[PDB]
Design a protein around this ligand. Structure first.
Ligand SMILES: OC[C@H]1O[C@H](O[C@H]2[C@H](O)[C@@H](O)[C@@H](O)O[C@@H]2CO)[C@H](O)[C@@H](O)[C@@H]1O
Ligand SMILES: [Ca+2]
Length: 404
């Protein structure tokens, strides 16, 4: 009978691709339906270009796509409206914020699958070894701790040891890190939900100069080419005091044979001062049925299964990825495995979004300008002051005549 073909997640990032294919195969086995998994590149913006090839061709060759939180405004024409396939009570089992994110001009483009937010990973053993009893609350403290711990560990002979690793490659991940820097210095949201391009200000400038000041000092020079997995691999081998990353790194760090198993915790990212806002960029992925699927009914059944309570629970327990169902945050098994799901719930609830709603279908162009100008500051090519000014002008061009 039909073959239900799924493109979602990547075998190049942690266990997400492997686990995704396993779930899709379990749905196939359970329902007696043939399925195939199509693998994707690591980086979201590369996945977007890949999938856009299928969409442009109206291709029936993928039935189900895992789409980024930043995509609904872009991909809406390519999505089957799910709204008629769910009751109001079913829909309300998901967080309203994400359902709303996924709903474009009344169309429910996708079901919420897992959410994410940026967080600070930190080595507890190393903090204790150097006399610190809490992870840093401010960026200055992160720097001070990173310098002292690095000096010590280098002297003890770990020539691989760094203070801080993050995503500084020129891609969507840098847009994520950079929104956290700017917002946590009181510099705004780059583009505000009302359309105001606010990034040209002295706080945003300072946030970027500060990041520049990390490169080759407390962070490796090569951090300007790091995505999620490059940062994670330095961290996970035991070679970084701190890491900025998404929740999925926690379960990987705790796995049997991880050199850092039991040595780390997580907390909110630092901020410039006590009265700045906490910054955690909102991430996460959704499940879309293709408008070009020849098998909508079967594809919707697979998507409902993937987004169900027990599959999200498995995602939580085994891959430490955040559910999109409030009821899982009180589940005894989810919580015992990841107590920090409860500790940082308010951080996840206040996560700051990238400007995907306000930029809509032009978001990818906006983000590319953002990561290229930010990157120019990380490389030392421009100061923050010049970069935010150039960014403002580029975003103004990009969004001219665009209204939300
Ligand atoms: O790189 C930007 C991208 O990061 C996150 O996507 C992660 C995801 O959270 C992880 O579970 C795993 O799938 O790695 C992905 C990175 O390739 C955000 O979820 C996403 O919104 C963001 O655009
Ligand atoms: Ca994650």
């Amino acid at each position: 009978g039909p073959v239900i073909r799924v493109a979602g997640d990547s075998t190049a990032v942690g266990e997400g691709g492997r686990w995704m294919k396993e779930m899709v195969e379990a749905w196939g086995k359970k329902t007696g339906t043939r399925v195939e998994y199509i693998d994707s590149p690591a980086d979201t913006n590369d996945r977007l270009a890949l999938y856009q090839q299928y969409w442009a061709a109206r291709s029936p060759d993928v039935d189900v796509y895992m789409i980024d939180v930043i995509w609904p405004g872009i991909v809406a024409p390519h999505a089957l409206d799910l709204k008629p396939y769910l009751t109001e009570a079913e829909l309300k089992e998901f967080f309203p914020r994400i359902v709303q994110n996924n709903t474009i001009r009344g169309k429910l483009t996708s079901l919420p699958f897992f959410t994410a937010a940026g967080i600070l990973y930190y080595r507890k053993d190393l903090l204790e070894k150097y006399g610190y009893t809490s992870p840093p609350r401010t960026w200055n403290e992160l720097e001070q701790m990173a310098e002292r711990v690095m000096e010590g560990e280098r002297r003890a002979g770990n020539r691989d040891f760094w203070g801080f690793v993050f995503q500084g490659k020129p891609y969507e991940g840098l847009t994520c890190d950079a929104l956290e820097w700017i917002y946590s210095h009181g510099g705004g949201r780059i583009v505000e939900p009302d359309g105001t391009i606010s990034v040209n200000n002295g706080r945003a400038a300072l946030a970027l100069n500060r990041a520049h000041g990390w490169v080759g000092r407390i962070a490796p020079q090569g951090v300007t080419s790091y995505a999620e997995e490059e940062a994670r691999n330095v961290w996970q081998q035991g070679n970084s005091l701190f890491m900025r990353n998404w929740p999925y790194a926690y379960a990987l760090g705790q796995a049997e044979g991880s050199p850092i198993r039991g040595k780390f915790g997580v907390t909110v990212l630092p901020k410039a001062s006590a009265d700045a806002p906490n910054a955690a960029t909102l991430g996460g992925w959704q499940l879309m049925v293709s408008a070009y699927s020849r098998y909508p009914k079967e594809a919707v059944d697979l998507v409902k299964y993937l987004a169900s309570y027990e599959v999200q629970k498995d995602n939580a327990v085994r891959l430490s990825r955040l559910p999109t169902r409030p009821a899982l945050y009180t589940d005894r098994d989810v919580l015992a495995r990841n107590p920090w799901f409860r500790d940082l719930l308010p951080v996840f609830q206040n996560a700051v979004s990238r400007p995907s709603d306000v930029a809509g279908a032009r978001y990818n162009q906006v983000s590319e300008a953002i990561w290229t100008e930010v990157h120019s500051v990380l490389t030392g090519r421009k100061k923050g002051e010049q970069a935010v000014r150039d960014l403002e002008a580029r975003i103004r061009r990009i969004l001219r005549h665009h209204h939300h």
